[PDB]
Amino acid sequence: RSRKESYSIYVYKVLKQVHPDTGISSKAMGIMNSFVNDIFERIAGEASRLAHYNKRSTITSREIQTAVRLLLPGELAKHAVSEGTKAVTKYTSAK
Amino acid sequence: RSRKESYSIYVYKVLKQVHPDTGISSKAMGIMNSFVNDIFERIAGEASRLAHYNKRSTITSREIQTAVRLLLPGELAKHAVSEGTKAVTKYTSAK
Amino acid sequence: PHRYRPGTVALREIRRYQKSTELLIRKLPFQRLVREIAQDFKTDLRFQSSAVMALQEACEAYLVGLFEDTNLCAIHAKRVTIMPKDIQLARRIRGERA
Amino acid sequence: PHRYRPGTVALREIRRYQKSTELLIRKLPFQRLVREIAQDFKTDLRFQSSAVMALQEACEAYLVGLFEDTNLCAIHAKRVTIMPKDIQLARRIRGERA
Amino acid sequence: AKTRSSRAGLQFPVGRVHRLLRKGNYSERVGAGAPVYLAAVLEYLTAEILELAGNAARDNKKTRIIPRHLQLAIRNDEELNKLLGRVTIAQGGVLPNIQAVLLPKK
Amino acid sequence: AKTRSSRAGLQFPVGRVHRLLRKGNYSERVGAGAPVYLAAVLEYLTAEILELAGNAARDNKKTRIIPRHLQLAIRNDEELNKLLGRVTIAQGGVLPNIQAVLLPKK
Amino acid sequence: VLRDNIQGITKPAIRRLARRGGVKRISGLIYEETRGVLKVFLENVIRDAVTYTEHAKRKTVTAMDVVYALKRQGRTLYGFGG
Amino acid sequence: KRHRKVLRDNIQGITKPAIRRLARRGGVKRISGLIYEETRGVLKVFLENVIRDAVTYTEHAKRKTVTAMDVVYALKRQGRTLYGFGG
DNA sequence: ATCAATATCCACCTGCAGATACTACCAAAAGTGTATTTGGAAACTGCTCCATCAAAAGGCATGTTCAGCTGATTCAGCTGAACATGCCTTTTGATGGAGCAGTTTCCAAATACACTTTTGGTAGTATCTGCAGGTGGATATTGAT
DNA sequence: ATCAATATCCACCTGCAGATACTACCAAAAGTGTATTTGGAAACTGCTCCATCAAAAGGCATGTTCAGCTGAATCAGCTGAACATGCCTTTTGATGGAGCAGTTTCCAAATACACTTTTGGTAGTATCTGCAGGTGGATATTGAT
Ligand SMILES: O=C(O)c1ccc(P(c2ccccc2)c2ccccc2)cc1
Ligand SMILES: [Au+]
Ligand SMILES: [Mg+2]
Ligand SMILES: [Mg+2]
Ligand SMILES: [Mg+2]
Ligand SMILES: [Mg+2]
């Protein structure tokens, strides 16, 4: 009965933007969920350590950004950083 | 001048118990300090994860115990679990 | 009758099994082995179907990976035939033992 | 005029260095190399001297460990001489370049 | 009432990411930008994989992404392969790859 | 006023371990037994290491434990060696070990 | 015709695994070596899985128990939850 | 005011004898002449990776000084945990 | 080379296992209004970190010499690849019930808060003691003969 | 075997860095004692989904045959060890200067928290279809001659 959350709604929405005529199997979707949760945990984990090392009680976008740089290879990091900074800009410039 | 705490005091007490006539260099003490901090984080981290996995918000001696069985190999686990069970049983019966 | 030369079917199987993703160990014997090993740690255990499958996916992907490194160790020694010493060297360097 | 045969002094050196714990790379050159590499990432950095020593202890322990694995790769090939291909195989199996 | 995702221009759920940061014991406090940034990062990486996996489906005359396609996408891209170097994709198989010295001579 | 270390039978500091568990963001709550059990495990392990290192000191005709003695103790014990298999002990060196084929003669 | 459970991992199945690993030729001693290695892997992962089971006060090993075990053994598996 | 002298080619300070010594500690009896450049290259990669992470922690903390702690945390991230320098 | 055997590729077809679509709640995001909390912005320290200069040794660079290791070559014998099929183990699908999971309850045990007490980490001086590094000088080890 | 060169061992012996010893010590913990809140064990049980098993399925155990791989043996070339010789660069230990980690005190901004709306997201349910296998026939690959 109880709710079992996942990212699949959102993975599917991003799939449609990227390949509008392409679908995805259930198994493939499980893998994509595992992927999001894994990277979530690695980034959050590094951000947590970063805050703790600097005796801060708060994880900000600056900890998320440094974590991304520590965790992602080169080109992926650059784009992830630019996508993250863009989303925070759009979010702020929005009454 | 701020207080930089360490486990030195306690490492030394334990040294005197096992080898009454043996000293320890400050570099050896540095290592022993890194070792305790390291094992603390590993046990605490396994305990944290384990509680989250079971939707608990409390880390009890039961979470520590399991984390110790996950982290330590064979005999060290067995002996560690005995000393910890016995420290709690004693602690509980001493108030 | 007609007879393929030694190695010709071996190559063919390499191409065939690298194209596909089906599990390559039969399910029941795997499941028995899992339960046997599990019995030494706790008796009267049941297993979700997906629990055993996750285990079989993990062992097979591990063993395939190990066979790749094993093969590199055989080739390093100017052979094309994998041996126990190749598996042992691969495990040693990986840090799985010794 | 007296000569040890090839291998005799090499074995003596293995016993000598395996017995001792001192850093084997000269300090000032190692420090220059750290400063050069860091400078290429970021200008105007300073280093605590213990930071540089921590890097040198890490780099030496990594290299010693790599040479053990490399040596096993040579011996597996029925040689006693380590070659670049032994280091590369060790690094590949370790997953440093897998 | 507007969602924080829609404000940030994102498909990934900012609110959920925020909650998952609170209740994961990562820190005592969470800044307002952090879930936005994190959600955008996860969306980005999701798009990148779905892009290359889609392409792999296309190459194999298929319109539905399966684990095989995810495996092909990940292991043929140098950066994704590194990010996911200690990860097993169930039902992924491996890349076709035969060592040269094993190919028949004549 | 008795310390919780004295109540529990312990040289290692229970209060300190409780506090480090709180400030580390491991969980919302910390049970009363948890730091007692953890301080004991920590004490056990350090006793184990110091026993063996003390022995390596004595074997090398020394009274003061240095990092080399800690390394010999760790690397000569199968279990401590596995527990610490991805750790470097500064100024530790290595175990004496020469592969057999490298020795002279036959 | 009784038979060990380990031996149910058969020469041809080990051979298929090798083939997916790109192996052309296989010594006869590999089959027993491989069985030993597989047993160790299963022991190490099942141990941790069951330890999670026992901690949750369950009698059924879940996919999640296996997934968490694999993760801490440095063998992260995607597609079965978590 | 002062500057800094240009740092170039410092990898060559990891000399042939220093590399022999490290190999000896690692149990090596005989060493091909190509090993020295190959080792310099492996060393450079390993240093770049650790320094990159350590400098990232420095910059995050808004310091100009790389601490032992920054190096220790960079080594830990890299799966090369080091005892003896804090933490 | 030619030529047969068999593997491999491609077009087309089609039923249904497994997608995508739709509906309808409702937990959990968002909105609102206070109630804490924090991370600096300025404004000072005392560090260490950098720089540099001089002396000295300890290790490094180089060239020579040839020991013995590597890699090529050849080859014989052993050892794994290929092979046809019915026996038998696994796969498939149908059916009780174990136990996971939903739900509710309630108190032993947790956090919170304001005192009181004690310990651990400093820093100032003082003393001590283990052992690093130097000294012969008695005991191996190696390699030429 | 025996002999001579030289590395190794070991044990005693003085300078001293690093260790242990107080002293005093205070600021931050840690402890003690109510007041207050609640997480999760306990108990009951609904309903997945798990173990078992009968009939249907199709992979593997087997023994023979010999292709071709591995490992042994031989050896010519040349690479890499050993060592002598000349001296550059590192090590060591000063000294000064300052760039900058590390604190502390005030707030303006930011984030938590208790309370209410107002959905977006899930489970359950209902349609829709991509493609796994199947066949049929052309073509490539392999191996024999
Ligand atoms: O990182 C790898 O994946 C890797 C694979 C193989 C080798 P081996 C090697 C030896 C024979 C055939 C094929 C490969 C090697 C490398 C350089 C020169 C000579 C031999 C080295 C590295
Ligand atoms: Au190789
Ligand atoms: Mg004792
Ligand atoms: Mg001495
Ligand atoms: Mg030749
Ligand atoms: Mg088809």
PDB file of C-alpha atoms (C1' of nucleotides) in Angstrom, chain J residues 38-127:
ATOM      1  C1'  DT J  38       8.543  10.863  21.513  1.00  0.00           C
ATOM      2  C1'  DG J  39      10.868   6.981  18.782  1.00  0.00           C
ATOM      3  C1'  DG J  40      10.192   2.602  18.071  1.00  0.00           C
ATOM      4  C1'  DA J  41       9.218  -2.062  20.366  1.00  0.00           C
ATOM      5  C1'  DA J  42       5.174  -4.751  20.916  1.00  0.00           C
ATOM      6  C1'  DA J  43       1.234  -6.972  19.342  1.00  0.00           C
ATOM      7  C1'  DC J  44      -2.026  -8.077  16.060  1.00  0.00           C
ATOM      8  C1'  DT J  45      -2.918  -9.557  11.072  1.00  0.00           C
ATOM      9  C1'  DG J  46      -3.718  -8.557   6.005  1.00  0.00           C
ATOM     10  C1'  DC J  47      -2.094 -10.122   1.730  1.00  0.00           C
ATOM     11  C1'  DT J  48       2.158 -10.295  -1.005  1.00  0.00           C
ATOM     12  C1'  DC J  49       5.241 -13.186  -2.743  1.00  0.00           C
ATOM     13  C1'  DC J  50       8.092 -17.165  -1.431  1.00  0.00           C
ATOM     14  C1'  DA J  51       9.093 -22.508  -1.155  1.00  0.00           C
ATOM     15  C1'  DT J  52       7.467 -26.401  -2.920  1.00  0.00           C
ATOM     16  C1'  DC J  53       6.489 -29.485  -6.636  1.00  0.00           C
ATOM     17  C1'  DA J  54       4.406 -31.673 -11.167  1.00  0.00           C
ATOM     18  C1'  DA J  55       4.919 -31.683 -15.899  1.00  0.00           C
ATOM     19  C1'  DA J  56       7.398 -29.668 -19.761  1.00  0.00           C
ATOM     20  C1'  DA J  57      11.914 -28.326 -21.493  1.00  0.00           C
ATOM     21  C1'  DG J  58      16.503 -28.353 -23.592  1.00  0.00           C
ATOM     22  C1'  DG J  59      21.616 -28.074 -21.795  1.00  0.00           C
ATOM     23  C1'  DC J  60      25.425 -30.860 -20.408  1.00  0.00           C
ATOM     24  C1'  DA J  61      28.188 -35.219 -19.286  1.00  0.00           C
ATOM     25  C1'  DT J  62      30.653 -38.153 -21.820  1.00  0.00           C
ATOM     26  C1'  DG J  63      35.235 -40.405 -24.475  1.00  0.00           C
ATOM     27  C1'  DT J  64      37.770 -39.883 -28.573  1.00  0.00           C
ATOM     28  C1'  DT J  65      40.843 -37.542 -31.624  1.00  0.00           C
ATOM     29  C1'  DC J  66      44.685 -34.704 -32.867  1.00  0.00           C
ATOM     30  C1'  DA J  67      45.780 -29.436 -33.826  1.00  0.00           C
ATOM     31  C1'  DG J  68      48.545 -26.452 -32.110  1.00  0.00           C
ATOM     32  C1'  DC J  69      50.054 -24.450 -27.759  1.00  0.00           C
ATOM     33  C1'  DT J  70      53.340 -24.506 -23.879  1.00  0.00           C
ATOM     34  C1'  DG J  71      57.493 -25.103 -21.921  1.00  0.00           C
ATOM     35  C1'  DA J  72      62.310 -26.939 -22.387  1.00  0.00           C
ATOM     36  C1'  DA J  73      66.761 -26.080 -24.305  1.00  0.00           C
ATOM     37  C1'  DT J  74      70.108 -23.561 -26.716  1.00  0.00           C
ATOM     38  C1'  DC J  75      72.412 -19.415 -27.602  1.00  0.00           C
ATOM     39  C1'  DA J  76      74.107 -14.661 -29.645  1.00  0.00           C
ATOM     40  C1'  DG J  77      73.757 -10.057 -28.671  1.00  0.00           C
ATOM     41  C1'  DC J  78      73.573  -6.298 -25.950  1.00  0.00           C
ATOM     42  C1'  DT J  79      71.494  -4.199 -21.899  1.00  0.00           C
ATOM     43  C1'  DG J  80      71.954  -2.994 -17.414  1.00  0.00           C
ATOM     44  C1'  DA J  81      74.991  -3.740 -12.839  1.00  0.00           C
ATOM     45  C1'  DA J  82      79.048  -2.458 -10.624  1.00  0.00           C
ATOM     46  C1'  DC J  83      82.365   0.815  -9.673  1.00  0.00           C
ATOM     47  C1'  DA J  84      85.863   4.683 -10.144  1.00  0.00           C
ATOM     48  C1'  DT J  85      86.142   9.347 -10.500  1.00  0.00           C
ATOM     49  C1'  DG J  86      85.034  14.444 -10.435  1.00  0.00           C
ATOM     50  C1'  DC J  87      82.213  17.838  -8.258  1.00  0.00           C
ATOM     51  C1'  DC J  88      77.260  20.168  -7.962  1.00  0.00           C
ATOM     52  C1'  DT J  89      73.321  20.489  -5.129  1.00  0.00           C
ATOM     53  C1'  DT J  90      71.174  19.413  -1.235  1.00  0.00           C
ATOM     54  C1'  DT J  91      71.107  19.794   3.716  1.00  0.00           C
ATOM     55  C1'  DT J  92      71.326  22.418   7.794  1.00  0.00           C
ATOM     56  C1'  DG J  93      70.712  26.493  10.626  1.00  0.00           C
ATOM     57  C1'  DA J  94      70.858  30.590  11.014  1.00  0.00           C
ATOM     58  C1'  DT J  95      67.983  35.745  10.424  1.00  0.00           C
ATOM     59  C1'  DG J  96      63.924  39.205   9.099  1.00  0.00           C
ATOM     60  C1'  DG J  97      59.795  40.371   7.313  1.00  0.00           C
ATOM     61  C1'  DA J  98      55.002  39.786   6.332  1.00  0.00           C
ATOM     62  C1'  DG J  99      51.552  37.508   4.334  1.00  0.00           C
ATOM     63  C1'  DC J 100      47.795  35.398   6.398  1.00  0.00           C
ATOM     64  C1'  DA J 101      45.691  31.837   9.407  1.00  0.00           C
ATOM     65  C1'  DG J 102      43.107  32.269  13.426  1.00  0.00           C
ATOM     66  C1'  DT J 103      39.896  35.026  16.952  1.00  0.00           C
ATOM     67  C1'  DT J 104      36.485  37.980  18.734  1.00  0.00           C
ATOM     68  C1'  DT J 105      32.334  41.185  18.828  1.00  0.00           C
ATOM     69  C1'  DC J 106      28.147  42.943  16.504  1.00  0.00           C
ATOM     70  C1'  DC J 107      24.034  42.261  13.358  1.00  0.00           C
ATOM     71  C1'  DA J 108      21.579  41.914   8.847  1.00  0.00           C
ATOM     72  C1'  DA J 109      20.306  38.147   6.338  1.00  0.00           C
ATOM     73  C1'  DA J 110      19.353  33.638   6.145  1.00  0.00           C
ATOM     74  C1'  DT J 111      17.318  29.240   7.708  1.00  0.00           C
ATOM     75  C1'  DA J 112      14.500  26.594  11.076  1.00  0.00           C
ATOM     76  C1'  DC J 113       9.768  25.800  12.931  1.00  0.00           C
ATOM     77  C1'  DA J 114       4.621  25.527  13.811  1.00  0.00           C
ATOM     78  C1'  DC J 115       0.543  25.935  11.163  1.00  0.00           C
ATOM     79  C1'  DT J 116      -2.458  25.811   6.718  1.00  0.00           C
ATOM     80  C1'  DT J 117      -3.590  25.470   2.129  1.00  0.00           C
ATOM     81  C1'  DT J 118      -2.887  23.508  -2.274  1.00  0.00           C
ATOM     82  C1'  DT J 119      -0.961  20.296  -5.523  1.00  0.00           C
ATOM     83  C1'  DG J 120       2.298  16.894  -7.920  1.00  0.00           C
ATOM     84  C1'  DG J 121       3.228  12.023  -7.502  1.00  0.00           C
ATOM     85  C1'  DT J 122       1.830   7.383  -6.540  1.00  0.00           C
ATOM     86  C1'  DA J 123      -0.939   2.975  -6.671  1.00  0.00           C
ATOM     87  C1'  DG J 124      -4.286   0.944  -8.859  1.00  0.00           C
ATOM     88  C1'  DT J 125      -6.488   0.390 -13.066  1.00  0.00           C
ATOM     89  C1'  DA J 126      -6.994   0.579 -18.224  1.00  0.00           C
ATOM     90  C1'  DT J 127      -5.336   0.621 -23.161  1.00  0.00           C
TER      91       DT J 127
END
